Amino acid sequence: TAAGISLTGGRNRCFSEWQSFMHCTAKTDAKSRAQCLPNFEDYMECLHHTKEKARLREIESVLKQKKE
Amino acid sequence: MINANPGFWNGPFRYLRWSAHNRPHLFFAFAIGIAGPVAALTLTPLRRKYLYPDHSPLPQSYPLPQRAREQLTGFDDE
Amino acid sequence: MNTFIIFIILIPIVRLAFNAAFILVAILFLPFDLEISTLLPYVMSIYLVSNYGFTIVLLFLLILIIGFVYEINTNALKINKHNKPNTDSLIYKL
Amino acid sequence: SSSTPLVKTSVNYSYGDYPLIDADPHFKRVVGYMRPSDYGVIGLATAALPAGICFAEWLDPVKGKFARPSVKFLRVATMLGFAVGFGAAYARSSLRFFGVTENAREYKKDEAQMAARKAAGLEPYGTSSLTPELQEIAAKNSAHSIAGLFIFPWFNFVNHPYHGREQK
Amino acid sequence: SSSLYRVLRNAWEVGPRSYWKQLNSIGDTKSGRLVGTDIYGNKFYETDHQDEIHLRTRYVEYKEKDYD
Amino acid sequence: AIPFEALLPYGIIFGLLTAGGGAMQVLHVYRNGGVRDRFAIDQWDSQMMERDLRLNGGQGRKQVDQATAPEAFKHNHVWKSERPLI
Amino acid sequence: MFIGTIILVLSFLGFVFNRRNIILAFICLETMLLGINLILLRNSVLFDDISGSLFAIVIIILAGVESAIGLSLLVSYYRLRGVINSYGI
Amino acid sequence: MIINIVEILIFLVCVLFSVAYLTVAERKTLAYMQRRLGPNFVGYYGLLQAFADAVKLLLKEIVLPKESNYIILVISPLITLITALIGWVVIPLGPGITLGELNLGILFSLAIGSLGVFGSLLSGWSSNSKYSLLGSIRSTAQLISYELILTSIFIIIIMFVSSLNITTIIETQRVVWYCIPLLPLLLIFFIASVAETARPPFDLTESESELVAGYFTEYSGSPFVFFFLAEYSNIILISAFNGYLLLGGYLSFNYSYLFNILFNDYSYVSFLFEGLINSSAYAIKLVFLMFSFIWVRAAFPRFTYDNLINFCWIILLPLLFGIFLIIPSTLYIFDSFPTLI
Amino acid sequence: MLILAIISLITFVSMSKLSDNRAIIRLINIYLILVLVLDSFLYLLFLNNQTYTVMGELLIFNSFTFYIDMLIYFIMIVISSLYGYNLYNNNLYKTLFEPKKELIILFLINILGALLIVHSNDFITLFVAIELQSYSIYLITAIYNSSYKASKASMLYFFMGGILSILIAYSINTYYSVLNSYTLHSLDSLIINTLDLNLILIALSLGLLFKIGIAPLHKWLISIYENTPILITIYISLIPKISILSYLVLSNISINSLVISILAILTLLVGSVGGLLQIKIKRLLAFSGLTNAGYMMLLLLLNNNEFSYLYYITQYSISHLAIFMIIIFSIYYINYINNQYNPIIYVNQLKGLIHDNAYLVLSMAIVVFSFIGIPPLLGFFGKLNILMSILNNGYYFISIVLIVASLISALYYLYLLNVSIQDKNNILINSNETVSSVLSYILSSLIILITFGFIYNSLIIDIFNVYFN
Amino acid sequence: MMYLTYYFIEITIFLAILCTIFIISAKNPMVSILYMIALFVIAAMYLYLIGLGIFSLLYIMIYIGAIAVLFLFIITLLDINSTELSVKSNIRDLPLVLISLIVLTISGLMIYSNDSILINKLLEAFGNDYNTIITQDWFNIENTTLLTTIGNVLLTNNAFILLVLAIVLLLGIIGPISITMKHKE
Ligand SMILES: CCCCCCCCCCCCCCCCCC(=O)OC[C@H](COP(=O)(O)OCCN)OC(=O)CCCCCCCCCCCCCCCCC
Ligand SMILES: CCCCCCCCCCCC(=O)OC[C@H](COP(=O)(O)OCC[N+](C)(C)C)OC(=O)CCCCCCCCCCC
Give me the DSSP letters along I316-375.
Answer: HHHHHHHHHHHHHHGGGG-S----SS-S--BGGGSTTHHHH-HHHHHHHHHHHHHHHT-T
Residues preceding gaps in chain A (C to N > 2.5 Å)? none
Q: Is the dihedral of CA D114, D118, D124, D127 positive or negative?
A: negative
- Residues I155/I161/I167/I170 CA torsion (nearest 10 deg): -80
Give the residue extent of every domain in chain H: 1-340
Which of the ligands is closest to the CA of residue I201? 1
Which CB contacts under 8 angstroms, 24+ apart, belong to I396-404? I398/I261, I398/I264, I398/I265, I398/I298, I401/I265, I401/I268, I401/I269, I402/I268, I402/I295, I402/I298, I404/I268, I404/I272
Report CA(I325)–ligand 2 centroid distance (Å).
22
Within 10 A of I362 (CB to CB), how many other CB atoms are there?
Answer: 13
- CA separation, residue B55 to residues B58, H1, H236, H326, I284 (Å): 9, 48, 42, 22, 69
Cα angle H28, H30, H36 (rounded to 5 degrees) comes to 70
Q: Is the peptide bond before B6 cis (omega within 30 degrees of 0)?
A: no
- Taking the C-alpha atoms of residue I39 and residue D40, their distance in angstroms, rounded to an integer, is 15
Q: Which domains does chain C have, with CATH numbers?
A: 3-74 (1.20.58.1610)
Among chain J residues, CA nearest to I175:
J112
Report CA(J107)–ligand 1 centroid distance (Å).
6
DSSP states of D28-88: HHHHHS--HHHHHHHHHHHHHHHHHHHHHHHHS-SSSS--PPPHHHHHHHHHHHHHHHHHH
Residue H194 CA, chain-centre distance (Å), reads 9
**Are the C-beta atoms of residues F24 and C3 closer than 8 Å to each other?**
no
- Taking the C-alpha atoms of residue G8 and residue G13, their distance in angstroms, rounded to an integer, is 9
For residue I378, give the nearest of I288, I317, I438 by alpha carbon: I317
**Using CA positions, which residue lies closest to atom 25 of ligand 2?**
I40
Q: Which residues pair with E37 in a beta bridge?
A: E43
Q: What are phi and psi of J169, to 5 degrees?
A: -70, -30
Q: Which residues pair with C65 in a beta bridge?
A: none
Which residue range is the domain that position B51 belongs to?
2-77
Is beta strand J132-134 parallel, antiparallel or unpaired with respect to E58-61? unpaired
- Taking the C-alpha atoms of residue H315 and residue I68, their distance in angstroms, rounded to an integer, is 45
**Are the C-beta atoms of residues H341 and J144 closer than 8 Å to each other?**
no
Q: What are phi and psi of C43, to 5 degrees?
A: -65, -25
DSSP states of H29-93: HHHHHTT---S-SSSSSSTTHHHHHHHHHHSS-----TTS-SHHHHHHHHHHHHHHHHTTTT--S
- Taking the C-alpha atoms of residue D39 and residue I132, their distance in angstroms, rounded to an integer, is 36
Residues in chain H: 341
**Using CA positions, which residue lies closest to atom 42 of ligand 1?**
J107
Give yes or no for J169 touching I (CB within 8 A). Answer: no
Q: Which residues pair with E47 in a beta bridge?
A: none
- Tell me the Cα Rg of chain A: 17
Is beta strand E43-46 parallel, antiparallel or unpaired with respect to E58-61? antiparallel
Q: How many domains does chain B have?
A: 1
Is beta strand F80-82 parallel, antiparallel or unpaired with respect to J132-134? antiparallel
Could you tell me the maximum CA-CA distance found in chain E, to the nearest angstrom? 35
Give the residue extent of every domain in chain D: 1-168
Cα angle G52, G53, G55 (rounded to 5 degrees) comes to 65
Q: Is the peptide bond before H338 cis (omega within 30 degrees of 0)?
A: no
With a Cβ cut-off of 6 Å, ligand 2 is lined by I 40, 43, 63, 67, 70-71, 74, 307, 310-311, 314, 449, 453, 456, 460, 463-464, 467
Within 10 A of B57 (CB to CB), how many other CB atoms are there?
Answer: 16
Burial readout I94-113 (b: 16 or more C-beta within 10 A, e: otherwise): eebbebbbbbbbbbbbbbbb
DSSP states of chain A: --TT--TTSS--SSHHHHHHHHHHHHH--TTGGGGGHHHHHHHHHHHH--HHHHHHHHHHHHHHTS--
Terminal Cα distance for chain J, rounded: 70
- The helix-helix angle for I258-273 and I397-420 (nearest 10°) equals 20
- Taking the C-alpha atoms of residue B32 and residue A10, their distance in angstroms, rounded to an integer, is 38
Burial of I461 from C-beta contacts in 10 A (0-12 / 13-18 / 19+): exposed
- The helix-helix angle for I219-227 and I148-179 (nearest 10°) equals 140
For residue I447, give the nearest of I374, I375, I384, I370 by alpha carbon: I370
Residue I52: strand, helix, or coil: strand
Half-sphere exposure of H279 (CA within 13 A, CB side): 28
**Cβ G20–J16 below 8 Å, yes or no?**
no
- Taking the C-alpha atoms of residue H68 and residue H52, their distance in angstroms, rounded to an integer, is 29
**Are the C-beta atoms of residues A30 and A55 closer than 8 Å to each other?**
no
**Are the C-beta atoms of residues A20 and A42 closer than 8 Å to each other?**
yes
Residue H102 CA, chain-centre distance (Å), reads 19
Give yes or no for J121 touching I (CB within 8 A). Answer: yes
Q: Is the dihedral of CA D118, D121, D127, D133 positive or negative?
A: positive
- CA separation, residue D160 to residues D4, D24, D129 (Å): 9, 9, 10
- Taking the C-alpha atoms of residue H149 and residue H312, their distance in angstroms, rounded to an integer, is 8
Give J139's contacts in chain B (Cβ within 8 Å). Answer: 61-62
Candidate from G2, G31, G84 with C-beta closest to J78:
G84
- Taking the C-alpha atoms of residue D68 and residue F16, their distance in angstroms, rounded to an integer, is 78
Three-state SS sequence of chain E: CCCHHHHHHHHHHCCHHHHHHHHHHCCCCCCCEEEEECCCCCEEEECCCCCCCCCCCEEEECCCCCCC
**Cβ H162–C65 below 8 Å, yes or no?**
no
Q: Which amino acid is at D88?
A: A
Q: What are phi and psi of E37, to 5 degrees?
A: -130, 145
Half-sphere exposure of I431 (CA within 13 A, CB side): 11
**Are the C-beta atoms of residues I69 and J174 closer than 8 Å to each other?**
no
Residue I26: strand, helix, or coil: helix
- Taking the C-alpha atoms of residue H312 and residue H144, their distance in angstroms, rounded to an integer, is 11
For residue I135, give the nearest of G38, H52, G66 by alpha carbon: G66
For residue H193, give the nearest of H296, H83, H88 by alpha carbon: H296
Candidate from H318, H329, H330 with C-beta closest to B26:
H318
Within 10 A of J45 (CB to CB), how many other CB atoms are there?
Answer: 17
Those of residues 392-451 in I touching chain D at CB distance below 8 A are 436-438
- Tell me the Cα Rg of chain D: 20
For residue J170, give the nearest of H230, I105, H210, D139 by alpha carbon: I105
- Taking the C-alpha atoms of residue H144 and residue I300, their distance in angstroms, rounded to an integer, is 49
Q: Is the peptide bond before D25 cis (omega within 30 degrees of 0)?
A: no
Is beta strand F80-82 parallel, antiparallel or unpaired with respect to E58-61? unpaired
Method: cryo-EM
- Taking the C-alpha atoms of residue G49 and residue A44, their distance in angstroms, rounded to an integer, is 15
DSSP-derived letter for residue I93 is: H
- Taking the C-alpha atoms of residue F82 and residue J133, their distance in angstroms, rounded to an integer, is 6
**Are the C-beta atoms of residues I292 and I309 closer than 8 Å to each other?**
no
Could you tell me the maximum CA-CA distance found in chain H, to the nearest angstrom? 71
How close is the nearest chain D Cα to the Cα of B57, in Å? Answer: 7
Could you tell me the maximum CA-CA distance found in chain I, to the nearest angstrom? 73
3-state helix, strand, coil in chain D (%, to 5): 55, 0, 45
Give H117's contacts in chain J (Cβ within 8 Å). Answer: 65, 69
Three-state SS sequence of J105-134: HHHHHHCCCCCCCHHHHHHHHCCCCCCEEE
Cα angle G47, G50, G53 (rounded to 5 degrees) comes to 105
Report CA(I172)–ligand 1 centroid distance (Å).
15
- CA separation, residue H65 to residues A11, C53, H69 (Å): 63, 58, 8
H helices of I39-89, where?
A: 63-78, 81-84
- Taking the C-alpha atoms of residue I45 and residue I48, their distance in angstroms, rounded to an integer, is 9
**Are the C-beta atoms of residues H139 and H303 closer than 8 Å to each other?**
no
Within 10 A of A65 (CB to CB), how many other CB atoms are there?
Answer: 8
